[PDB]
Amino acid sequence: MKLNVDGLLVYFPYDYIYPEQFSYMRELKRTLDAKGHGVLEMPSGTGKTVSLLALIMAYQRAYPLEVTKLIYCSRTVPEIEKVIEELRKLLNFYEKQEGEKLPFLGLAL
């Protein structure tokens, strides 16, 4: 599922995304393009993590110099474990799409 976002093309593992996901991605891309701190709210407990991670990875690929790395913080370790699971699934999907390993590292402290 490759989404032709206004800023660029962004990969996505799951089949379909709700319109609220489109709005989230476009607003997040606007904030990153402005390179200014901002705040936004999304209802779903899950799904926001995958959309955010996919958009950040695509933005990193497009403008690697713009963003050095992502620092994604969660309330509790049991919760951040689910985030690392989501990131692992996304990386597996992207690796299958590309056909080879890429210099991408992701870890939890």
Partner 1 sequence: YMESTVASWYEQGILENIQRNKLLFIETQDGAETSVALEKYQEACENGRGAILLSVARGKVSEGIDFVHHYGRAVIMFGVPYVYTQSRILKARLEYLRDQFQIRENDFLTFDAMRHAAQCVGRAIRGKTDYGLMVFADKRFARGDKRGKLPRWIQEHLTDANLNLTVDEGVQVAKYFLRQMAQPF
Name 86's bridge partners.
none
Smaller CB distance to partner 1: residue 13 or 60? 13
What's the farthest any 2 CA atoms get from each other in the chain?
36
Using rule CB under 8 A, residue 13 touches partner 1: no
Dist CA 100 CA 31 (whole Å): 31
Dist CA 77 CA 35 (whole Å): 29
Does 76 carry a binding-site annotation?
no
Specify the 3-state DSSP secondary structure of 21: helix
Does 44 carry a binding-site annotation?
yes
Smaller CB distance to partner 1: residue 48 or 61? 48
Piece of 9-17, 42-50, 52-60, 91-99 that binds partner 1 (CB under 8 A): 42-50
Residue 87 CA from chain centroid, whole number: 8
Cβ 106 vs Cβ 87: under 8 Å: yes
Quick one: which of 4, 34, 36, 45 contacts partner 1 (CB under 8 A)? Answer: 45
Quick one: which of 23, 44, 92, 97 contacts partner 1 (CB under 8 A)? Answer: 44
In the complex, minimum distance from the CB of residue 103 to partner 1, in angstroms, rounded to a whole number: 31
Contacts with partner 1 by CB under 8 A lie at: 41, 43-47, 75-76, 78-79
